[PDB]
Amino acid sequence: STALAKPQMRGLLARRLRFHIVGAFMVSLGFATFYKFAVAEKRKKAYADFYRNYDSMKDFEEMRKAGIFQSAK
Amino acid sequence: ASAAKGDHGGTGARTWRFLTFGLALPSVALCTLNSWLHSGHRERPAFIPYHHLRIRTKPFSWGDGNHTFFHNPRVNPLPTGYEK
Amino acid sequence: HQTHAYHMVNPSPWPLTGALSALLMTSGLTMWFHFNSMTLLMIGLTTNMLTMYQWWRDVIRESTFQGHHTPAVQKGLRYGMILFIISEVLFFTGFFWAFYHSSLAPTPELGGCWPPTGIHPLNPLEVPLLNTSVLLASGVSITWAHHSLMEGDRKHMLQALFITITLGVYFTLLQASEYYEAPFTISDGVYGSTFFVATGFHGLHVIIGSTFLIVCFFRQLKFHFTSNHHFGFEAAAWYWHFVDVVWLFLYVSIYWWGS
Amino acid sequence: SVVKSEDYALPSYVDRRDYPLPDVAHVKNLSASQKALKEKEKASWSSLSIDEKVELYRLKFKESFAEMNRSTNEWKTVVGAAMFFIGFTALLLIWEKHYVYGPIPHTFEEEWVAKQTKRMLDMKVAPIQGFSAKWDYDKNEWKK
Amino acid sequence: HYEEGPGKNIPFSVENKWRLLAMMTLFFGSGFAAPFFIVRHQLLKK
Amino acid sequence: MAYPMQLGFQDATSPIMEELLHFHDHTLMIVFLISSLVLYIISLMLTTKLTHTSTMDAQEVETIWTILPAIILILIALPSLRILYMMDEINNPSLTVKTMGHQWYWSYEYTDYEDLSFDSYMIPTSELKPGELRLLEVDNRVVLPMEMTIRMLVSSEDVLHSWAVPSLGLKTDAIPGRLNQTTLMSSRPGLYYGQCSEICGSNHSFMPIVLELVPLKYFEKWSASML
Amino acid sequence: APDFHDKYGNAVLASGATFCVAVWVYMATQIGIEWNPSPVGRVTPKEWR
Amino acid sequence: HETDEEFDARWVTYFNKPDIDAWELRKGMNTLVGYDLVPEPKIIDAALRACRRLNDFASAVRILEVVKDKAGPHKEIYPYVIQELRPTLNELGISTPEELGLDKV
Amino acid sequence: ASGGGVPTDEEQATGLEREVMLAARKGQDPYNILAPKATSGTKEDPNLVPSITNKRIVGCICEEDNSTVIWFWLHKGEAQRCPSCGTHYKLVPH
Amino acid sequence: KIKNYQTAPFDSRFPNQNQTRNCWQNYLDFHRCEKAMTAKGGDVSVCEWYRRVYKSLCPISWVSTWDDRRAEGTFPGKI
Amino acid sequence: MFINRWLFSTNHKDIGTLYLLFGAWAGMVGTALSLLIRAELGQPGTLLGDDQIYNVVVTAHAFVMIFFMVMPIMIGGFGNWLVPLMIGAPDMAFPRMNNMSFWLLPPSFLLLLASSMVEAGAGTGWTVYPPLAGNLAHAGASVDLTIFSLHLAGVSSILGAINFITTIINMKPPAMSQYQTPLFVWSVMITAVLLLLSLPVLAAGITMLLTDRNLNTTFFDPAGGGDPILYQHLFWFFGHPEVYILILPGFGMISHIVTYYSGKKEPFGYMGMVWAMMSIGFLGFIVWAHHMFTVGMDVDTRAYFTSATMIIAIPTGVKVFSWLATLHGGNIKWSPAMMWALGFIFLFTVGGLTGIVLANSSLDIVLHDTYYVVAHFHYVLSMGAVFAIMGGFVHWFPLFSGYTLNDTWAKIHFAIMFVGVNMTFFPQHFLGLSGMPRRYSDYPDAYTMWNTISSMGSFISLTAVMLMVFIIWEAFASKREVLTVDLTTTNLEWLNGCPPPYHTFEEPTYVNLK
Amino acid sequence: FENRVAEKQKLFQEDNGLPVHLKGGATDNILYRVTMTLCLGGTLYSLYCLGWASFPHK
Amino acid sequence: ITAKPAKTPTSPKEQAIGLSVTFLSFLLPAGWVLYHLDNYKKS
Numbered sequence A: 001s002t003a004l005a006k007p008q009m010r011g012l013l014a015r016r017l018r019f020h021i022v023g024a025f026m027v028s029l030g031f032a033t034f035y036k037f038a039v040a041e042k043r044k045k046a047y048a049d050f051y052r053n054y055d056s057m058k059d060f061e062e063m064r065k066a067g068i069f070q071s072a073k
Numbered sequence B: 001a002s003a004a005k006g007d008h009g010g011t012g013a014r015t016w017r018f019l020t021f022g023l024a025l026p027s028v029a030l031c032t033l034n035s036w037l038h039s040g041h042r043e044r045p046a047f048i049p050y051h052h053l054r055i056r057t058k059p060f061s062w063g064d065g066n067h068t069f070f071h072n073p074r075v076n077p078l079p080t081g082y083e084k
Numbered sequence C: 001h002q003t004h005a006y007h008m009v010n011p012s013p014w015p016l017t018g019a020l021s022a023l024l025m026t027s028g029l030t031m032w033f034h035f036n037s038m039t040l041l042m043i044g045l046t047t048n049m050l051t052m053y054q055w056w057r058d059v060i061r062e063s064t065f066q067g068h069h070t071p072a073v074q075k076g077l078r079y080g081m082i083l084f085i086i087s088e089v090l091f092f093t094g095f096f097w098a099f100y101h102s103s104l105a106p107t108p109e110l111g112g113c114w115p116p117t118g119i120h121p122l123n124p125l126e127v128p129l130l131n132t133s134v135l136l137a138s139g140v141s142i143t144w145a146h147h148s149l150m151e152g153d154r155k156h157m158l159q160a161l162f163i164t165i166t167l168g169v170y171f172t173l174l175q176a177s178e179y180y181e182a183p184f185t186i187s188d189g190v191y192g193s194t195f196f197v198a199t200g201f202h203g204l205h206v207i208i209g210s211t212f213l214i215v216c217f218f219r220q221l222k223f224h225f226t227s228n229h230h231f232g233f234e235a236a237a238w239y240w241h242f243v244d245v246v247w248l249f250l251y252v253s254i255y256w257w258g259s
Numbered sequence D: 001s002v003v004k005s006e007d008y009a010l011p012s013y014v015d016r017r018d019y020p021l022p023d024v025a026h027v028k029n030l031s032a033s034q035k036a037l038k039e040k041e042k043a044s045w046s047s048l049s050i051d052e053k054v055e056l057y058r059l060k061f062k063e064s065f066a067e068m069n070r071s072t073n074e075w076k077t078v079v080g081a082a083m084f085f086i087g088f089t090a091l092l093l094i095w096e097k098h099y100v101y102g103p104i105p106h107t108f109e110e111e112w113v114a115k116q117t118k119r120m121l122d123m124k125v126a127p128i129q130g131f132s133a134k135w136d137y138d139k140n141e142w143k144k
Numbered sequence E: 001h002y003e004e005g006p007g008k009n010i011p012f013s014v015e016n017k018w019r020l021l022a023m024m025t026l027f028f029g030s031g032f033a034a035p036f037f038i039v040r041h042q043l044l045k046k
Numbered sequence F: 001m002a003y004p005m006q007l008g009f010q011d012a013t014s015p016i017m018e019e020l021l022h023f024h025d026h027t028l029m030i031v032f033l034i035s036s037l038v039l040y041i042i043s044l045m046l047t048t049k050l051t052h053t054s055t056m057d058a059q060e061v062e063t064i065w066t067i068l069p070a071i072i073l074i075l076i077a078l079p080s081l082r083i084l085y086m087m088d089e090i091n092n093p094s095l096t097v098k099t100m101g102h103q104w105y106w107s108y109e110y111t112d113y114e115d116l117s118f119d120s121y122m123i124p125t126s127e128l129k130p131g132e133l134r135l136l137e138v139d140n141r142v143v144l145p146m147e148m149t150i151r152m153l154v155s156s157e158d159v160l161h162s163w164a165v166p167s168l169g170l171k172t173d174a175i176p177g178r179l180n181q182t183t184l185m186s187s188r189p190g191l192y193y194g195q196c197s198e199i200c201g202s203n204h205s206f207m208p209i210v211l212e213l214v215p216l217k218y219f220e221k222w223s224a225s226m227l
Numbered sequence G: 001a002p003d004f005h006d007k008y009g010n011a012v013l014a015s016g017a018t019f020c021v022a023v024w025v026y027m028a029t030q031i032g033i034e035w036n037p038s039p040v041g042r043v044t045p046k047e048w049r
Numbered sequence H: 001h002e003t004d005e006e007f008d009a010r011w012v013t014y015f016n017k018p019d020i021d022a023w024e025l026r027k028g029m030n031t032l033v034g035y036d037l038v039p040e041p042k043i044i045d046a047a048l049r050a051c052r053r054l055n056d057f058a059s060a061v062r063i064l065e066v067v068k069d070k071a072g073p074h075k076e077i078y079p080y081v082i083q084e085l086r087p088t089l090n091e092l093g094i095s096t097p098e099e100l101g102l103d104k105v
Numbered sequence I: 001a002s003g004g005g006v007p008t009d010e011e012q013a014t015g016l017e018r019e020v021m022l023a024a025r026k027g028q029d030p031y032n033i034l035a036p037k038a039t040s041g042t043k044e045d046p047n048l049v050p051s052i053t054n055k056r057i058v059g060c061i062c063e064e065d066n067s068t069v070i071w072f073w074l075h076k077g078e079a080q081r082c083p084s085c086g087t088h089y090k091l092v093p094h
Numbered sequence J: 001k002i003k004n005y006q007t008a009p010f011d012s013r014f015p016n017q018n019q020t021r022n023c024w025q026n027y028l029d030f031h032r033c034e035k036a037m038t039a040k041g042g043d044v045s046v047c048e049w050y051r052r053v054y055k056s057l058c059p060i061s062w063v064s065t066w067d068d069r070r071a072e073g074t075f076p077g078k079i
Numbered sequence K: 001m002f003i004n005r006w007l008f009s010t011n012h013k014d015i016g017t018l019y020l021l022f023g024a025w026a027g028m029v030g031t032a033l034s035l036l037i038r039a040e041l042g043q044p045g046t047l048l049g050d051d052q053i054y055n056v057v058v059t060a061h062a063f064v065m066i067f068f069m070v071m072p073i074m075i076g077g078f079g080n081w082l083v084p085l086m087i088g089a090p091d092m093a094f095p096r097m098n099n100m101s102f103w104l105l106p107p108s109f110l111l112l113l114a115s116s117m118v119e120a121g122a123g124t125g126w127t128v129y130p131p132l133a134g135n136l137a138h139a140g141a142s143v144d145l146t147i148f149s150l151h152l153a154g155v156s157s158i159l160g161a162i163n164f165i166t167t168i169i170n171m172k173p174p175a176m177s178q179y180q181t182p183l184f185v186w187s188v189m190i191t192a193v194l195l196l197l198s199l200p201v202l203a204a205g206i207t208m209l210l211t212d213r214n215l216n217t218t219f220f221d222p223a224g225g226g227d228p229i230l231y232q233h234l235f236w237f238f239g240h241p242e243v244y245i246l247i248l249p250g251f252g253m254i255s256h257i258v259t260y261y262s263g264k265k266e267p268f269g270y271m272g273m274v275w276a277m278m279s280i281g282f283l284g285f286i287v288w289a290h291h292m293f294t295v296g297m298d299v300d301t302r303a304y305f306t307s308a309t310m311i312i313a314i315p316t317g318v319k320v321f322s323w324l325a326t327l328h329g330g331n332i333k334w335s336p337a338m339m340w341a342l343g344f345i346f347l348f349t350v351g352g353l354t355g356i357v358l359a360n361s362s363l364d365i366v367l368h369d370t371y372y373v374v375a376h377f378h379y380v381l382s383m384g385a386v387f388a389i390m391g392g393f394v395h396w397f398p399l400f401s402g403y404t405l406n407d408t409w410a411k412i413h414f415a416i417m418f419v420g421v422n423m424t425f426f427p428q429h430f431l432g433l434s435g436m437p438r439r440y441s442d443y444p445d446a447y448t449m450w451n452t453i454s455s456m457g458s459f460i461s462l463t464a465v466m467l468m469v470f471i472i473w474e475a476f477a478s479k480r481e482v483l484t485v486d487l488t489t490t491n492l493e494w495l496n497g498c499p500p501p502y503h504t505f506e507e508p509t510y511v512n513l514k
Numbered sequence L: 001f002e003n004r005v006a007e008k009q010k011l012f013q014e015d016n017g018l019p020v021h022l023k024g025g026a027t028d029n030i031l032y033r034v035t036m037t038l039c040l041g042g043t044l045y046s047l048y049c050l051g052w053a054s055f056p057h058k
Numbered sequence M: 001i002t003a004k005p006a007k008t009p010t011s012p013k014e015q016a017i018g019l020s021v022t023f024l025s026f027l028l029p030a031g032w033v034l035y036h037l038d039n040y041k042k043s
């Protein structure tokens, strides 16, 4: 037989809170990085890639040949 | 301001009666003189059928629908001009 | 038995008759504007006056005759009256906002100017100035009446209160004459709209305030007020000063600056 | 035992784990044997039997902590009943579709939608991300 | 003066639950039905 | 135009609308973060049998609760206001077009040179040509030169309307007696759709806007042919 | 003593879930509702002009 | 504020008051369990002996229950506290809730 | 300039208004217009709570500036204690 | 004549979204100028810039109504 | 006796009961109107008619839900029942005027119903903007009946505000300062100040509309030098305070509910909660033109109104985090009222955050007059004000009636409503961002999926409303009488029993100064 | 005039159970009946007018 | 909260009746109007 050791008995709620607010912060950072990568930067790159060599006249001629315009046959 | 009078030792009933008869009612009497002096009908201006005046978007709920509530024939033209 | 100082009011029909009077006046105005008939409106105005008469009659019975207005009750009525006046200030503020909006930015339809082309304002130095002196004077005489009452002087309270009422009536008669003589009307675009709706609501409040002063005059004749307890007089005086201050703002804004 | 409406202004009994010692005992009236038990409680508690100790506890308190803190099967009823009423809602929607709604516009016919889709691609609707970006104009098919 | 206590401080009776069910049905049902019947009214006009 | 099951904004057709997309992405990240943090803290407060029910001191924690939100608001306001003033910048248009709202259609006036004006009405569903869009097509589109700064002036000849084209980031109320200005610059040719955006009576749902963006030379010849 | 939830909770949960899924799947798929899903990966574009 | 030891000592003194009355016993325990802590054995010991002086066996058992409850999911705290209290439990003839069957739902 | 003829409250106040006035003159507060001043609140020196019945609600502001008021019925009999701060109160029915 | 007019230029007097007064002022200026020029034996051609600006900015119905009211004698601006 | 008691009342509890009954009946009307909206929109095409009948339904939906359901229930119902009890007062200051605030509401509602029965109804939006609401585009009596309905509702609330302010200032125990009154009492006082200052400006604006329609004024008519935009300023000078009036009593009830079911004697951070409500009330008067970002205002004005609107997030955040800090360490009781309050904290936060999105005038150009605005305000109204109402109703029903609800049924009700409102309104964010306008009876085909889902969500909320009626019936049918209520030491309104006697605090509380 | 407030105080404090709005005597009942009859009758009339106005005429 | 057992218990059968009646009171009148919409419009 052996005695049980004295456990921590005070501040258990505050200890739990501190630990998980920290965890919530670290996750918030992890999510912000994911979001800037998966959403915000994705969008900036999609628009920059699209316009980098975009030829508006070629786009127009395609639309015109497809018949979409009132003003251009 | 202090305006130009004096007293403030006891603002009581006697002081406010003094103000009523010595300042307030004389002022009314002066302005009554001044008014009933510039009275008398000034001459009505040419009628011009301005579109921002004599508004009629719905007939008035009284009379013939075309006269304002305190219509004065002498000075209030209808949309078509002064009354005869 | 209670051991607080507040007033448990007897069950009363006047809230219901007042609410129904509001239904009859509003549905009555609708009938007048759209169905060419004044019948509902006249019933509503009648029941409204009956309600006001019996309701305030009962407040007098509860206070002068039954003693329910302890200091705590009176203090509540002071707050109630102050808050009511505040709501009325904000009501007028909406009409002043309308006036300044239209006059500070006159649109092309007006000529792009204020006063509009074709509007000939009243001279603010004629009857409008007289009306200003009249309401200012009545604020002096109502203050004399208040101090006479506090000093226990029945005759001079009545004299001063009578002079105050006479001046309120003078204002109302002068304003009615000015309405008749004015060469512009409520249908003369936004100039006439702001002029007559704002001064017209003010005139209605002069009539209300004058009526309240007259109620106080007859209660004073009947010895209801003591030299220390006379909240109905205080409330009427506060309302009267409110009516005076609204006039000064109308005079400066619409009659003088807006001319 | 019996709590009465007319007792509302008197100190009352409660089982709350954050108020372990309530304002009154659970049982105030004692029978002859219960009186004798309270007298015995003034002597060494080592001389009380287990049953006597339980009886003293149950005179003082209604439920133990374990009893007052017990979990229940109520969530099954709540979730199941909520799903039943949500399911009942779909019956209303079925009734509505059958008896209230008429045909939808002809622009939802399959051929119309196929032509409208081509025309959207021809005018390059949302060509950066939203729509035409998902069409492969070189291979003439939806991108994989 | 007035009745006090549960079921007595309300302008409707709860002495019989089935009479109550009828009254509550008329009360809440009339409020819910009214807009449908106003829509019907406006459609039948014109 | 919008497409089926769309979750976010129509793709940008103008530089200002691209700015708005990136600003929305920034602000939505913050919205998601705060909402998720509140949901998480709620769940944290509700998932322990540990208790602490005595009085808690508030002073210290309320500094965090005010200063951190104030910082976040500033981080929203700065790009918000930058875009606001960008949209306001002087830009020197090449063309002015007016649109007047009516019950229930739009008229357009191009009066820089010639007196060109016409009405633009929704195509009824029964008259759509195959592949045309229900409630969105018009008989006479607002033809405009692409890649050029256009001044659009908006008014109404009856009740309020509002002239909107989401993919260009445009919405200007149409108010009788008032001439409101906005600027329009399309980076691309094509067809860009909008819908009346102020309740205006029986056919508010049914008075749409269709811009047709083409090269200047085509715009010029179209203009001449519309006189 | 077993209460209502001990006696009937399992059946209420099971029957409620089953009923709810069945009726919403039916409503969603069998009565002609037009959900208007995306054409992407679904619709073969067809000549219109 | 004060050290842990100063806190514990104030509470020991509170329950050790020889003529502590029933109201003060309840006030003390109902206040103590509002704090973010499981009370030290030495506090519980003093409260149990106050129960003895007040001839209140049931409240002694209840105090043992509330120790277990304040530990929440920390299942190691209550057996430790009972271990530390066993001499007092034996001296005073206090049965634990478990020995009385009062841990059964 | 000045004269009389206006009744005074002493002459014409009636009803509850008059009761409050006359009691105040005597330094009495039967209608609870004033806040009572606390005693030390010990069992020896309890706060004395007047009542016209056998129970009255007490609110205890245990410490100056607490925003939380602690409410309980005080019954005729032995003094009772605020459940938060323990300060003693005793009913004095009359 | 310092021409090649495309549209009305930015006008610092009217820098905001509400352009009503810009239309109005140029309409007034054109007609004021035309009045001056017809009068003193001069050329309305000098007024042309105002004409181009107000015709660019002003809704057709506003111009039409203002023209009608000038003909009727009910135009409320000063010309 | 029946007429004396229920038509001639001067009793704050009975009048409170009258308001709760009126508000519940209005809630049924408002729910029916919401289902007609979503039936029209739940498949593409036209169901009822064109946009006139459609927007008469939309307009009445809003007026009924705001002026006849939320305000009567929160202020007239919970305010009259609870405020006097929470300060130990024997009634309201003006108990007879209080009864007229109640009895003005059935005539107000009658006027609104009349507006929809005559002519073609008032299809204007609840904002009633001219010129659509003027006498050419809305000829005939409908809009005038709407104006008069609002006049009566406004008088009712102005007099009620006078009553509440006077009662709360003047009728506390003499030892109780304003900083010893419960947060719900604070929330009602502040709401009453907002009503007192804002409703007279609405009254001025709608009276102007009335005279433009009937007396040939031209306040809003450019032909006379008027301006439609002036009406918008006057309306919204009231209308932004109005949304804080709709939420503040809810914040007060949430504070009490969260405190109670956390097993706490007090909310966390009492003075910060007072500060936050006062701050919200004050800032709510200086932000109105964020309802007008597309009307053509100058850029610096847009920048001011963007910034001043956003700062309201700071005091509101203090309240949210303080509710979380009240839960912290609680002995949590998972009552149905607690579920409503927890739903409130989260879903009100979501709606408040999309409100912050909309505060950005640049982004609001694209979001204004779209369903993104509709999504914002139903998160804070159907999932905020209404969740506080349901939480307060479930929590205090035993106080008012003396009988308990079946808690299992009330939890089932919460679950169904929670699913329904989120299915209704979450997809409307997508509809708004992708450009669906407000006040449309039909939409381009692309918007079909989310409109179909939103309409199905509205039918789930109908099922919850029907179930609520049954739950109330079951409680009165079974007559389980209340015995003991915990935490009365910090919840004075329960200390006189359930229901409390007709007269309470005939002998006032004893509170000394110390 | 003479101060007759004392007489009115006696009348309105008479222990007769009358509510204040009827405590003046039979005239109060008459004025109450007139007011309530006009209000209830007028409200019925307003409902009739709604009925009339709810349908197109001619 | 604690409470007395019901003075007038409402059995499951009784609750099914109350619930069914309550739901029908909402659904039948509105369903009647909606069922007959075309009759109103197509007239």
Ligand code: HEA
Residues within 6 Å of the ligand: F034, F038, F068, F069, F070, F072, F073, K127, K243, K244, K246, K247, K290, K291, K309, K310, K312, K313, K314, K316, K317, K318, K320, K348, K349, K350, K351, K352, K353, K354, K355, K356, K358, K359, K360, K364, K367, K368, K369, K373, K376, K377, K380, K381, K384, K385
């Ligand atoms: C109860 C009703 C209610 C409430 C409380 C609110 C609260 C807010 N509302 Fe809303 N709103 C309406 C009801 C409401 N609103 C209605 C009905 C309309 C439409 C009117 C019509 O046109 O018919 C509308 C329209 C509306 C608009 C006009 C949009 C347009 O028409 O284009 C705007 C713009 O600024 C707005 C913004 C806000 C903001 C910023 C708040 C803020 O008070 C919200 C503050 C709350 C939070 C921010 C969440 C909690 C805070 C934290 C957790 C702290 C951390 C947060 C940050 C750092 C951001 N609302």
Ligand SMILES: CCCCC/C=C\C/C=C/C/C=C\C/C=C\CCCC(=O)O[C@H](COC(=O)CCCCCCCCCCCCCCCCC)COP(=O)(O)OCCN
Residues within 6 Å of the ligand: B068, B069, B070, B071, B072, B076, C029, C172, C175, C176, C179, C180, C181, C182, C183, C184, C185, C186, C187, C196, C197, C199, C200, C201, C203, C204, K151, K154, K155, K203, K207, K210, K211, K215
């Ligand atoms: C002499 C000084 C005092 C005068 C008061 C006279 C009667 C008016 C009563 C006061 C009501 C005040 C505001 C009502 C609005 C308009 C009246 C404005 C004042 C007035 O009397 O304006 C007159 C027009 O009255 C008209 O149309 C009259 C229209 C008559 C119907 C009255 C208005 C009916 C609608 C009232 C709505 C009330 C809404 C109340 C809201 C309260 C909200 C809390 C001006 O006459 P005129 O011939 O146009 O020009 C003079 C030309 N020589």
Ligand SMILES: CCCCCCCCCCO[C@@H]1O[C@H](CO)[C@@H](O[C@H]2O[C@H](CO)[C@@H](O)[C@H](O)[C@H]2O)[C@H](O)[C@H]1O
Residues within 6 Å of the ligand: C036, C037, C038, C039, C043, L037, L038, L039, L040, L041, L042, L045
């Ligand atoms: C006991 C409580 C009080 C209850 C009050 C009930 C009063 C009911 C009387 C109504 O009488 C109607 O009044 C209409 C309008 O009042 C009249 O219409 C007439 O009235 C207009 C106004 O003078 C005319 O211009 C129109 O031609 C004409 O339709 C119409 O003959 C008549 O049927």
Ligand SMILES: CCCCCCCCCCO[C@@H]1O[C@H](CO)[C@@H](O[C@H]2O[C@H](CO)[C@@H](O)[C@H](O)[C@H]2O)[C@H](O)[C@H]1O
Residues within 6 Å of the ligand: D092, D095, D096, D099, K035, K036, M026, M027, M028, M029, M030, M031, M032, M035
């Ligand atoms: C948004 C709120 C409401 C949405 C959901 C409403 C759910 C519907 C409940 C049922 O309503 C009933 O439906 C019947 C059809 O099932 C209708 O009978 C109609 O149809 C029957 C079958 O064809 C005929 O027997 C009847 O004579 C004829 O009135 C009946 O009138 C109507 O009361």
Ligand SMILES: C[C@H](CCC(=O)O)[C@H]1CC[C@H]2[C@@H]3[C@H](O)C[C@@H]4C[C@H](O)CC[C@]4(C)[C@H]3C[C@H](O)[C@]12C
Residues within 6 Å of the ligand: C154, C155, C158, C159, C162, I005, L001, L002
């Ligand atoms: C009869 C009465 C005396 C009052 C009283 O002592 O009973 C006197 C005293 C004050 C008088 C009033 C005031 O002197 C003011 C007014 C003066 C006018 O000349 C007559 C009416 C007028 C209103 C007076 C009527 C009447 O003569 C009053 C009322």
Ligand SMILES: [C-]#N
Residues within 6 Å of the ligand: K239, K240, K243, K355
């Ligand atoms: C937000 N109003």
Ligand code: CUA
Residues within 6 Å of the ligand: F101, F102, F104, F160, F161, F162, F196, F197, F198, F199, F200, F201, F203, F204, F205, F207
């Ligand atoms: Cu035009 Cu809406």
Ligand SMILES: [Cu+2]
Residues within 6 Å of the ligand: K239, K240, K243, K287, K288, K290, K291
């Ligand atoms: Cu707002």
Ligand SMILES: [Mg+2]
Residues within 6 Å of the ligand: F162, F197, F198, K294, K368, K369
């Ligand atoms: Mg808009």
Ligand code: NA
Residues within 6 Å of the ligand: K040, K041, K042, K043, K044, K045, K046, K047, K441, K442, K443
């Ligand atoms: Na539709």
Ligand SMILES: [Zn+2]
Residues within 6 Å of the ligand: I060, I061, I062, I063, I070, I082, I083, I084, I085, I086, I087
């Ligand atoms: Zn205390």
